[PDB]
Amino acid sequence: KAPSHVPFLLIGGGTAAFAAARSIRARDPGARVLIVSEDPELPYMRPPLSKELWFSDDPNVTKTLRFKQNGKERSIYFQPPSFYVSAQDLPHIENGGVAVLTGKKVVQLDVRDNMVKLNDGSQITYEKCLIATGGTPRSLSAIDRAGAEVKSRTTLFRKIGDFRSLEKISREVKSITIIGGGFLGSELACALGRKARALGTEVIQLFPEKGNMGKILPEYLSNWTMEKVRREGVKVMPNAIVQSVGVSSGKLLIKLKDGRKVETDHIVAAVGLEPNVELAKTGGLEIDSDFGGFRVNAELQARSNIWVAGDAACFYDIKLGRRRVEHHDHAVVSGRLAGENMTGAAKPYWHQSMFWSDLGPDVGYEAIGLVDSSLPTVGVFAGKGVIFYLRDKVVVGIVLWNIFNRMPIARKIIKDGEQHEDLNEVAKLFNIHVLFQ
Ligand SMILES: Cc1cc2nc3c(=O)[nH]c(=O)nc-3n(C[C@H](O)[C@H](O)[C@H](O)COP(=O)(O)OP(=O)(O)OC[C@H]3O[C@@H](n4cnc5c(N)ncnc54)[C@H](O)[C@@H]3O)c2cc1C
Ligand SMILES: Nc1ccnc2cc(Cl)ccc12
């Protein structure tokens, strides 16, 4: 099936890989691109798995994997199978194409010989290679010590299969507990909260921070967000640190360090991500000790014929410094950029990528740049506002709270690197006419 040589080899079949394949095909007409994906599915977008797919009117959504966005229905897959060609035919099809080798994992990378070895022993030589391996969900040490019973009833949410299995659980058990206050955990709490209001079931979200998104948003806005999640039918337990997890009367028992105890039927752990850097060993590729991931330069390049994009890429931002970003749009932007550089562009990361979060069709966040609650922040509000994240009197990150269609404005503010004595005048650029942290 897999040919012996391919011009463009993309390792990983996710968002960054697909954006690169499209970019390569657009920049190099007739290009022959092979995606190798350990997952059995073709490249698909993940944001819907914690959002639109749960708010669908169609009860066959679990099968169709179609969702309504404003309002137009679409598939979770980036392209239908008709868009792709088979790997075996990729060398011979006139004017080339894009092929996906599913159910196959690259286990060895030989940088000197421009070659990889798959889990089945097959070997593929390449001319240009992209590493777009993404990451694997983290787990809690308390769950790793809890035993097989607890582990079998704990979900690490990332893939289509995780959505299908958790959606079935939401219709079978009476209580689900989400561990993690980040965007994924909070989105899933709002999604399961909607499903639980109709079924009369329970949804719990606990995390160590004082409020939802506490590591991202300032405290005043994190607390406002916590109240909104609570009003979606969720029992939110802030300031909760898990000490142990066990099984009691057939139910899961979560013991917190502060003495509280939570009984539940199923657990969903949304506690971050680890970059998939296993190939750095055989490949002799540098890993970044500070941010994790493959260390690459501003052009996303690691070695002469190897680039890295997406969640796994720790890159140099010429304006904001060395970073590693784990956002959907960043995978598209960095994958597209890598693709262009794999066809001779030599372009640095320049167009900043944005990210967003929806806590239902009511609350919506957009953000861009260096967004960290540790940085000093200035928030101008009017249920609506903009949060400026500062560094040396220069806005380095922006959060748009219920403000839409103004990302190009935020992108220009950060690019300009200007200093501002009255950020209230900058807030007017977002149609905002007070809080510090
Ligand atoms: C449920 C969910 C909701 C999200 N919602 C949002 C959102 O609303 N907004 C936002 O900005 N971001 C969101 N994100 C983040 C965004 O989806 C990720 O940043 C994006 O998917 C990263 O793209 P990627 O190509 O780098 O990695 P991935 O999408 O993880 O793709 C990597 C693929 O490569 C495979 N792979 C790994 N190693 C190998 C190997 N050795 N050989 C072969 N294949 C391999 C992995 O199995 C995976 O299939 C969400 C993520 C999840 C999971
Ligand atoms: N709404 C989001 C914004 C950014 N990053 C996210 C990562 C995950 Cl895993 C889930 C949701 C996200």
From Swiss-Prot:
Per UniProt, location of the Glycyl lysine isopeptide (Lys-Gly) (interchain with G-Cter in ubiquitin) cross-link in this chain: K128
This protein's encoding gene: AIFM1
Lineage: Eukaryota, Metazoa, Chordata, Craniata, Vertebrata
Species per Swiss-Prot/TrEMBL record: Homo sapiens
BP GO terms, sorted: apoptotic process; cellular response to aldosterone; cellular response to estradiol stimulus; cellular response to hydrogen peroxide; cellular response to hypoxia; cellular response to nitric oxide; intrinsic apoptotic signaling pathway in response to endoplasmic reticulum stress; mitochondrial disulfide relay system
Effect of substituting R303C: In DFNX5; uncertain significance
PTM per Swiss-Prot/TrEMBL: Under normal conditions, a 54-residue N-terminal segment is first proteolytically removed during or just after translocation into the mitochondrial intermembrane space (IMS) by the mitochondrial processing peptidase (MPP) to form the inner-membrane-anchored mature form (AIFmit). During apoptosis, it is further proteolytically processed at amino-acid position 101 leading to the generation of the mature form, which is confined to the mitochondrial IMS in a soluble form (AIFsol).
Keyword Transmembrane helix among record annotations: no
Family according to the record: Belongs to the FAD-dependent oxidoreductase family.
Keyword terms: Acetylation, Apoptosis, Charcot-Marie-Tooth disease, Cytoplasm, Deafness, Disease variant, DNA-binding, Dwarfism, FAD, Flavoprotein, Intellectual disability, Isopeptide bond, Membrane, Mitochondrion, Mitochondrion inner membrane, NAD, Neurodegeneration, Neuropathy, Nucleus, Oxidoreductase, Phosphoprotein, Primary mitochondrial disease, Transit peptide, Ubl conjugation
Impact upon substituting E366V: In CMTX4; increases affinity for NADH and electron transfer activity; increases affinity for DNA, resulting in increased apoptosis; no effect on interaction with CHCHD4
Residues at which FAD binds: 12-16, 38-39, 46, 51, 106, 158, 311, 327-328, 356
Reaction(s) the record says it catalyses: A + NADH + H(+) = AH2 + NAD(+)
Broad enzyme group: oxidoreductase
Principal localisation: mitochondrion
Effect of substituting G135S: Found in patient with mitochondrial encephalomyopathy with moderate clinical severity and slow progressive course despite early onset as well as and cerebellar involvement; likely pathogenic; decreased protein level; strongly decreased redox potential; strongly decreased NADH oxidase activity; no effect on DNA-binding
GO cellular component, as recorded: cytoplasm; cytosol; mitochondrial inner membrane; mitochondrial intermembrane space; mitochondrion; nucleus; perinuclear region of cytoplasm
Compartments (UniProt record): Mitochondrion intermembrane space; Mitochondrion inner membrane; Cytoplasm; Nucleus
Protein name: Apoptosis-inducing factor 1, mitochondrial
Annotated positions of the Phosphoserine modification: S141, S165, S244
Free-text function comment from the UniProt entry: Functions both as NADH oxidoreductase and as regulator of apoptosis. In response to apoptotic stimuli, it is released from the mitochondrion intermembrane space into the cytosol and to the nucleus, where it functions as a proapoptotic factor in a caspase-independent pathway. Release into the cytoplasm is mediated upon binding to poly-ADP-ribose chains. The soluble form (AIFsol) found in the nucleus induces 'parthanatos' i.e. caspase-independent fragmentation of chromosomal DNA. Binds to DNA in a sequence-independent manner.
MF (Gene Ontology): DNA binding; FAD binding; NAD(P)H oxidase H2O2-forming activity; NADH dehydrogenase activity; oxidoreductase activity, acting on NAD(P)H; poly-ADP-D-ribose binding; protein dimerization activity
N6-acetyllysine PTM sites in chain numbering: K261, K415
Covalent S-S links between cysteines: none
Residues annotated to bind NAD(+) 1: G181, G182, F183, L184, E209, K215, G272, E326, H327, W356
Subunit (UniProt): Monomer (oxidized form). Homodimer (reduced form). Upon reduction with NADH, undergoes dimerization and forms tight, long-lived FADH2-NAD charge transfer complexes (CTC) resistant to oxidation. Also dimerizes with isoform 3 preventing its release from mitochondria. Interacts with XIAP/BIRC4. Interacts (via N-terminus) with EIF3G (via C-terminus). Interacts with PRELID1. Interacts with CHCHD4; the interaction increases in presence of NADH.
Effect noted on mutating D358A: Increases protein dimerization at lower NADH levels
